Amino acid sequence: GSHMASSDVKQELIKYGKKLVETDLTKGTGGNLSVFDREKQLMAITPSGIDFFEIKESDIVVMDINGNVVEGERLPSSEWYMHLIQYQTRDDIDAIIHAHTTYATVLACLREPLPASHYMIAVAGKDVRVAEYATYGTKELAVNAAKAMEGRRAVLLANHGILAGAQNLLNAFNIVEEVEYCAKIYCLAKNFGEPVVLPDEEMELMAEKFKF
Amino acid sequence: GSHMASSDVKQELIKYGKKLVETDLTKGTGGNLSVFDREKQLMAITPSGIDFFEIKESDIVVMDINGNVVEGERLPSSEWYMHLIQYQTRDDIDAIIHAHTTYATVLACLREPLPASHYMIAVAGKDVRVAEYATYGTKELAVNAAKAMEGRRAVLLANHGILAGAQNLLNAFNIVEEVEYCAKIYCLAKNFGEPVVLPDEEMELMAEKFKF
Amino acid sequence: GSHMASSDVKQELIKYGKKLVETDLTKGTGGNLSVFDREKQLMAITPSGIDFFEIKESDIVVMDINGNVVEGERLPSSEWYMHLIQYQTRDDIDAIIHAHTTYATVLACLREPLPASHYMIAVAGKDVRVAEYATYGTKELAVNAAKAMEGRRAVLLANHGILAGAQNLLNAFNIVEEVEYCAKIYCLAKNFGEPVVLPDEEMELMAEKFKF
Amino acid sequence: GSHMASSDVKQELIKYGKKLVETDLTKGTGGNLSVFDREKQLMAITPSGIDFFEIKESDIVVMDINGNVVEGERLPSSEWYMHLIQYQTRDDIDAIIHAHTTYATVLACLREPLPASHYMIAVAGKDVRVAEYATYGTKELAVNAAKAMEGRRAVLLANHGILAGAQNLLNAFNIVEEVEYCAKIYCLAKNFGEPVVLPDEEMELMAEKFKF
Ligand code: NI
Ligand code: NI
Ligand code: NI
Ligand code: NI
Ligand SMILES: [Zn+2]
Ligand SMILES: [Zn+2]
Ligand SMILES: [Zn+2]
Ligand SMILES: [Zn+2]
Numbered sequence A, B, C, D: 001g002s003h004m005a006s007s008d009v010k011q012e013l014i015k016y017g018k019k020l021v022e023t024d025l026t027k028g029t030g031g032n033l034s035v036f037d038r039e040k041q042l043m044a045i046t047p048s049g050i051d052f053f054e055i056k057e058s059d060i061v062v063m064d065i066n067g068n069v070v071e072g073e074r075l076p077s078s079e080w081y082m083h084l085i086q087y088q089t090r091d092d093i094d095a096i097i098h099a100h101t102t103y104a105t106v107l108a109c110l111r112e113p114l115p116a117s118h119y120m121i122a123v124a125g126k127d128v129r130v131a132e133y134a135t136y137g138t139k140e141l142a143v144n145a146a147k148a149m150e151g152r153r154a155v156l157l158a159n160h161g162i163l164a165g166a167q168n169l170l171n172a173f174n175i176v177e178e179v180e181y182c183a184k185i186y187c188l189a190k191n192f193g194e195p196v197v198l199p200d201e202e203m204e205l206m207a208e209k210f211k212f
Helices: A005-023 A080-089 A103-110 A121-122 A139-148 A168-191 A200-211 B007-022 B080-089 B103-110 B119-123 B140-150 B169-192 B200-210 C007-022 C080-089 C103-110 C117-125 C140-149 C170-193 C200-211 D007-022 D080-091 D103-110 D118-125 D139-149 D169-192 D200-211
Strands: A032-037 A040-044 A062-063 A068-073 A095-099 A130-132 A153-158 A162-164 B032-037 B042-045 B062-064 B069-071 B095-098 B127-131 B154-157 B161-166 C032-037 C042-045 C059-062 C069-072 C093-097 C129-131 C154-157 C160-166 D032-037 D042-045 D061-063 D067-072 D095-099 D128-132 D155-156 D159-168
Touching: A005 A032, A005 A040, A005 A095, A032 A080, A032 A168, A040 A080, A062 A080, A068 B200, A068 C007, A080 A095, A080 A121, A103 A153, A103 A162, A103 A168, A103 B169, A121 A168, A121 A200, A130 A139, A139 A153, A139 C170, A153 A168, A162 A168, A162 D103, A168 D103, A168 D169, A200 C140, B007 B042, B007 B095, B007 B154, B007 B169, B032 B169, B032 C117, B032 D061, B042 D139, B062 B080, B062 B140, B080 B140, B103 B169, B103 C170, B103 D200, B119 B200, B127 B140, B127 D032, B140 B154, B154 B169, B154 C160, B154 D103, B161 B169, B161 D061, B161 D169, B161 D200, B169 C170, B200 D155, C007 C032, C007 C042, C007 C093, C007 C170, C032 C080, C032 C170, C032 D103, C042 C080, C059 C080, C080 D139, C093 C140, C093 C170, C103 C154, C103 C160, C103 C170, C117 C200, C129 C140, C154 C170, C160 C170, D007 D042, D007 D169, D042 D080, D061 D080, D080 D095, D095 D139, D095 D169, D103 D155, D103 D159, D103 D169, D118 D169, D118 D200, D128 D139, D139 D155, D155 D169, D159 D169
Parallel strands: A130 A153, B127 B154, C129 C154, D128 D155
Antiparallel strands: A032 A040, A032 A095, A040 A062, A062 A068, A095 A162, A153 A162, B032 B042, B032 B095, B042 B062, B062 B069, B095 B161, B154 B161, C032 C042, C032 C093, C042 C059, C059 C069, C093 C160, C154 C160, D032 D042, D032 D095, D042 D061, D061 D067, D095 D159, D155 D159
């Protein structure tokens, strides 16, 4: 009677799910959110195929570190393992959001990385890499996503979408927003001419400044 | 006193008409929705030239399989026959939505098909074909649309819009959304460079996964 | 005490002004609306420099056929004469809307006409012409706009915006919407490839069908 | 007890901060607003890192002409000095807004100026210049921004955003809006073909007309 993920975590997931829709970052489909509770070693993750505005507290699924569901009746998101494997291999990330946004996904389908034409990319790294292609909801995808997100808080999923993660849902949410905005900027610039990419040294500095 | 299309069907059509506007899939003009009742063999279809937010339950038109109106005073949508002919030739489709969306229509006016640069296209097929041109509201259009939608749940109407159909209004609605999103993705990618199209074998697999 | 433009006309102008903003056709600046009362020979026109959401019934300006203001304290729109000269030279138009929209204005600044890549252009003509450049609010502008709108219900104002007119405000409003949508379609298509323009004969037919 | 910036100024800053978000000019991040009180020689400026919809009256920071904070507990915007240096070197500007908008920022990352393809640019000048690059929140930035905004009410910040200033917050706000709209127009036109730039003489005239 205190051993499983708490009410407010489930509540947080439902709130940020809505907010993805309310800010039209995404319509809702194929997107998913999770949190990891490091003391408990439990992931709570959004259910499969349920509209973000129809998700109840009882729809959130709780899972142990090896994918054994321990709470909830609903199937977990088809991408539960893309989330879980990040929590298994990395300790700097406690909240992840998957989304099919617009311009990030555009870069994803070109299989092009996002460079630092805009400095705000630093919330995730000097650039965002694009994972190698794999079918949604499969182990290859999750593995491809863990590898290409190494050293970053975001990665593009080829022909698919975006994955981002941070210390909490607020911060995970802002990283999607900010990475979608930078991808938007970068695509539009590239219609006009040659976007100017800030050098690595400046991006290094940027990382340091963002720490504070 | 139970022989004609039911209250809730008419209600469903009015709701999804609004939702096309409320999500700015379309402004309202030249768009139309219908359902087929297979036991009754009756199509209920939106009226002609009535703003989606001014359609009453009594404005919905009910029609038999040969286009004989059996309920309602209003003229049926000028595209009643583009809808009806799909219900006459196909049993996997019970709800259809026509819409003038943005990027699908852009592909429609280039007379370019939508390939599988994004996997979610699978809600409709491996690709969306573009019908041969014909004047709105005519028999050639309906015939051109039935033929080019063969084997799919969507087709582009040259210089015009989009047509999609599924087992119900919810699913028809999501197919427009999803096909508009994929067309958007595909156009934007093509501004940047060469969009990567997933191969037929993967799309085949995608079809199977979506069944579940 | 019945000789001047009526309450509901002034009300109609305020409503459609808002609706330009509420549908984000335009933000508000440099846009203006008028109606002509043909029995009275009076134009009511929106005031100068007043935010569409701050216009009162007493802000609407009433003017005779030679520009003599007969009702209202506010300066009339700086474009009062671009409106008035259409009512002086044409009897098929009783309501006009000026707007700085997005893609129509884009065509306006390229000084490129809108051809019939989308059939809905027929609410205005087979194409929309672009007027020759002149400084906002001047006689050359109004004259350039009257001439290039000949035979149409819309014209593009070089480096400026759009002008449209119809038998009433509802219809004038829909023509802006529809012409902005077609310009949007046409620009986007032209990013991808060669938009297919429907021939004059088909557009002729389209005109006839729209009459009904 | 009348020596510091007034309640309504702080209120004005909070209102226009929201309105940047409510009109989706910007999402909120890295944007900031200030006013200068010339009789008092005090700048009130938005706080650092606080969401525009969570800023209280007590969060607004008041500062003297040399950057000494005289009111408020919060850190001032990281760009306090980009604002302050404009008030130190120029008397025609009493309110400034910084923002990361879309198409202005796109021009900023290409390091391309905005010419007069649309006449409304005149609310800021004949063109908007792009400042030389410098790291957000630093003295080089502020200096680069003061210099490249000379003779204008707006400047683009390379790989960053936009800065604009006017006699008050209302007018500063409209200049961002209007400059973002013109940048949007200009980028889109440049996708299609060669945008037509109005000549300096016409822009000179435009300046004079806007005075009235
Ligand atoms: Ni417990
Ligand atoms: Ni019956
Ligand atoms: Ni009277
Ligand atoms: Ni005091
Ligand atoms: Zn997904
Ligand atoms: Zn249609
Ligand atoms: Zn204007
Ligand atoms: Zn900034």
